[PDB]
Amino acid sequence: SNPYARGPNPTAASLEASAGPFTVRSFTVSRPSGYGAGTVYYPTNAGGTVGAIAIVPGYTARQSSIKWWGPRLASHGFVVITIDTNSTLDQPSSRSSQQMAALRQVASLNGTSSSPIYGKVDTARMGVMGWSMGGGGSLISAANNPSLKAAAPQAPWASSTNFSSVTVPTLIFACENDSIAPVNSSALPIYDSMSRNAKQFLEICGGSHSCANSGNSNQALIGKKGVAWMKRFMDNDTRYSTFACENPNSTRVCDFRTANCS
């Protein structure tokens, strides 16, 4: 039996829905350590400790752009911290450092008896997400910290597209019409650089650079894929292998590629 499996057996409908099974609460981090601000979203009743995911916005952007992931992931059994960076103009390497500082603080709060997440986190199971330069920051985090169990950046951008060293399972959300981090020169070459991992590339038809952000019109599919990827790889939960690895056969998807993902 898998000690990390949480929640009921998934279906397409349950993963496309507004929320998973678990009640979600949130709090603002009172003294952020190593990053600008954070909001923690957590399940009150997951039935065991859960992994932690840290999510970072893009250049000029704030938690509002990424916030929708907090309740959506947490309701399926994850502690999620969304951050603001120390400056809105921080670059990807700085964003990676701050992302790991946010994961560190989640681990600190897991050990703080006054915190709402005291004892709720398995600090050995962590994941990284983020938009654009925060997505490039997530890939840097994975390259530098290969114990991370999953990465799922959106509309990523980094100074170099070469992430050949990454061994962390990585799902890339791409936005077809992105004019800031174009698919062809950003998301796709980042995807193609990775030869050592389970990986996936999922491009949303018609998407602008913000197509995976809060308020987007594809939360059913994008949320299904993000949760399935994190469940399969952070929880080793093979009930999610098909959802994580499948072509979703969706008219909202204009390009789908995956490797080392059965």
Q: Catalytic positions, please?
A: 132, 178, 209
Q: Does 126 belong to an annotated binding site?
A: no
Q: What is the rounded distance in angstroms from the CA atom of residue 95 to the CA atom of residue 81? A: 14
Q: Does 157 belong to an annotated binding site?
A: yes
Contact between 81 and 54 (Cβ < 8 Å): yes
Contact between 215 and 227 (Cβ < 8 Å): no
Q: Does 59 belong to an annotated binding site?
A: yes
Convert 224-235 to b/e letters by CB count within 10 Å (16 or more is b).
Answer: bbbbbbbbbbbb
Residues forming a β-bridge with 201? 172, 257
Binding-site residues for poly(ethylene terephthalate) sit at 59, 133, 157
Binding-site residues sit at 59, 133, 157
